[PDB]
Symmetry: C2
Subunit: 195 residues, 2 copies
Amino acid sequence: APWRRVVYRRVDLMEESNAVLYYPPRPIGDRKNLFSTIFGLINSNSLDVYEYLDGFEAFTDQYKIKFQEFLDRFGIYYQPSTNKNAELFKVADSDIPSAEVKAYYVKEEWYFTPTNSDVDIKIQAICPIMTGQDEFGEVRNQPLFWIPYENIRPYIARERVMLSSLNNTRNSTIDDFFRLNLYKGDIVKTENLHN
Amino acid sequence: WRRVVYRRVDLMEESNAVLYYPPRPIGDRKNLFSTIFGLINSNSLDVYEYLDGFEAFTDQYKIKFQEFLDRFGIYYQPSTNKNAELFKVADSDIPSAEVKAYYVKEEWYFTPTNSDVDIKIQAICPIMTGQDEFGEVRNQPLFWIPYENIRPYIARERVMLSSLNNTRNSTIDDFFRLNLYKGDIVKTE
């Protein structure tokens, strides 16, 4: 009787509708983009992120990202932290690949409501995709990790963003952008859920 | 004296086709990736995480086979004999046909003899080409194999080479040790 599916969408930050998640490419003054926010939150032990696996998502302790391994894997320069409670490592903004994350994978869950006869679309998780040259000169698109939407929601609910579709209200947040499905992207995968 | 050189070895090229031969195990004949995969599954080979910028052959970066299978979407089932294999993996799900290149890490020794450049293989990295869960075709370095770890096994793997006038005594170890592979330098340290 219940009718559910999982939909994965590729959200390109170069498109006007999604540009809000990219500006500024590197932090300027008080403003930073979504990736710079995410990176800062992982470094401050405020956000649990999970390994990108090809074919499924597992938000378990086994697949929880080991931040140092992540930094070493993607060649991000770091130094020891002078206060382990504030940050796991000392990482300068210029070494953070916030300008290189030009797309996100967005996992949604579609739920049929019996009484309403309508379908509810709810964001479940997001995955930043980094574009850049590897150590061997190859340009690669690399999904970095999965962020369960519940983990990031308290922080993006406190991040104000201007949206032309919302007539540039100063009350809209990044959480509103995702919850209200204001992002645009193509469906890259679908999975029917079998209860 | 020493210098680290990385070479991309394309398995499609005639000179390197011997490492790709056959794309999947034809009865008893298996290619280099199939041998590697089989040894990791039988707990006979230690392989290490591919890191962008450096190689660390330490316990911290040792590949965990199940995590590797999950990460690269290789279908597996529980093993019926844990002593022979960690997991039951069908040949069609083993990406032996999708590994069409390797990164080869070389140590160059130079001397004061003259310009003796002696090239010693240090490690190899299979590169898998294929579509991910989201339809994107990607080139993915899988892991680093220290050459010493694989050497005793590929020293027992016979291969026919036209450059060696098809002797039945040449091994895959000879192919690597004698620098019979061909490829472009992609990085120098």
